[PDB]
């Protein structure tokens, strides 16, 4: 019989003594040993004295640590996170002129678009310790934790195609801004009156529904609750960057127009079927397309832009 160290955080460990008459799961639970799910194996001297990562049948104490480290997650989160980590170990990043981009494999292009976009967001941090740390590692050159984690949080499944735009915003819902951003909407009606609606921080740098800067500022007419026209318009905006997202819509990206944006994502394919994501940036008056490790450049491009990233805003009306 062997002894093994059981932890969920890599800081608190406990000794679990095991025999070799049932599987690890039978005696202990869902466990990973060096990345490998060995739950349905029988314990042997090789694993003696070693540390294991446990996914269910959690201690009361370990659960407390899970919540602190990862926040409130569903019970399957740990299994999904750890397994995704092993599944995705073989994914590769290619680096072009220091820009890192995820090489295409197992329908992961949507992730290449999410990560490459996140890599562009200045002054952001994650509230969840585990996510923040993984992120820092990601920026350190090791992206497995961050990638697996983001899939677990996004409830993605390895190998299955998934929505890029959707994941990007769940991920950001877990982030915070380290600097000051402010955006103010003014709504008005002759009977109800004027209303200032204020957003601060990350909330001030993202908007789903618009893909151009002009449209975000443009005056919007609708009907108020009282039975008349309610108007709405942006009256202040001070941000480090601006992320605008909308449905795959067809357009012409041109550098002659001398665009405002630094980068954008494009959805290639049909929408009722499975497509392909591409990340693109402007540096060089030219659009560099990062097609999942494959790099190409164009002057203009007929494409269906989804996500668009703008620089810092300093606007008053």
């Amino acid at each position: 019989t062997i002894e093994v160290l059981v932890t969920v955080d890599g800081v608190n460990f406990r000794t679990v003594v095991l025999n070799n008459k049932n599987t690890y799961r039978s005696q202990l639970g869902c466990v990973f040993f060096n990345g490998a799910d060995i739950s349905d194996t029988i314990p042997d001297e090789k694993q003696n004295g070693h540390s294991l990562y446990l996914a269910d049948n959690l201690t009361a104490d370990e659960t407390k640590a899970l919540k602190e480290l990862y926040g409130p997650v569903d019970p399957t989160f740990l299994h999904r996170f750890y397994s995704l980590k092993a599944a995705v170990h073989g994914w590769k990043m290619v680096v072009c002129d220091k820009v890192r981009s995820l090489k295409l494999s197992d329908n992961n292009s949507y992730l290449n678009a999410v990560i490459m976009t996140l890599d562009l967001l200045k002054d952001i941090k994650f509230v969840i310790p585990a996510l923040q740390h993984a992120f820092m590692k990601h920026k350190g050159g090791d992206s497995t934790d961050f990638i697996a984690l983001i899939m677990a949080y996004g409830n993605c499944t390895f190998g299955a195609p998934d929505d890029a735009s959707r994941l990007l915003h769940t991920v950001l819902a877990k982030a915070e801004l380290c600097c000051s951003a402010r955006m103010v909407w003014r709504e008005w009606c002759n009977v109800c009156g004027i209303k200032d609606v204020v957003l601060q921080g990350l909330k001030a740098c993202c908007y789903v529904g618009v893909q151009t800067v002009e449209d975000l500022r443009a005056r919007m007419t609708y009907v108020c609750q009282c039975g008349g026209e309610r108007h709405r318009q942006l009256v202040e905006h001070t941000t480090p960057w601006l992320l605008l997202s909308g449905t795959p819509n067809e357009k012409l990206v041109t550098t002659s127009t001398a665009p405002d944006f630094v980068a954008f994502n494009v959805f290639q394919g049909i929408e009722t079927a499975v497509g392909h994501y591409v990340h693109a940036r402007l540096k060089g008056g030219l659009i560099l397309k990062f097609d999942s490790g494959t790099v190409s450049k164009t002057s203009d491009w007929k494409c269906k832009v989804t996500d668009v990233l703008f620089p810092g805003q300093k606007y008053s009306s």
């Binding site: 195609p161 998934d162 929505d163 890029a164 993202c206 789903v208 392909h276």
Partner: protein
Amino acid sequence: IFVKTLTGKTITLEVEPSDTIENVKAKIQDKEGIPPDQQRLIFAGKQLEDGRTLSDYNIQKESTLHLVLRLRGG
């Protein structure tokens, strides 16, 4: 509240806001064919995440949610 499909049929179904976005999408699977899994609701420029509560988003009755179908990118 009201929820509109992109260039499409817009229904309103009302349920007291105690409800989790999971549940609006859940009553959505019970009124229109689509599964909560594939439906992403957008309100006032924010994607609603399953964890938070309609009350949390300041959403008032007669407010407009937007149903967008989850894309598949590979």
